[PDB]
């Protein structure tokens, strides 16, 4: 027997993920960057750098 054409529709769903990475930094460098623990010397900037 003869056959009629066939059609069809369809859908695909997304898959979802994520990444991560830590970057911890110290407290002494935190206080030496801002100026909170700075000094007026020739030895503070040598460590801020």
């Amino acid at each position: 027997p003869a056959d009629q054409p066939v059609h069809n529709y369809m859908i695909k769903r997304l898959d979802r993920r994520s990444l991560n990475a830590a970057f911890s930094i110290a407290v002494e460098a935190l206080g030496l960057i801002s100026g909170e623990n700075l000094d007026g010397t020739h030895i503070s900037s040598a460590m801020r750098l």
Binding site: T41, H42, I43
Partner: protein, 39 residues
């Protein structure tokens, strides 16, 4: 104050000298008032 010659040694070596500047210069060639006191 430690400055520009004791700086490097204090940072990397670990020591410092009061008159390191004059030592280096040698090894290579190179207001008043009036107060009430009793005398």
């Amino acid at each position: 104050v430690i400055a520009n010659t004791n700086l490097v040694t204090a940072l990397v070596m670990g020591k410092a000298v009061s008159n390191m500047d004059d030592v280096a210069r040698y090894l290579l060639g190179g207001g008043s008032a009036r107060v009430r006191a009793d005398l």
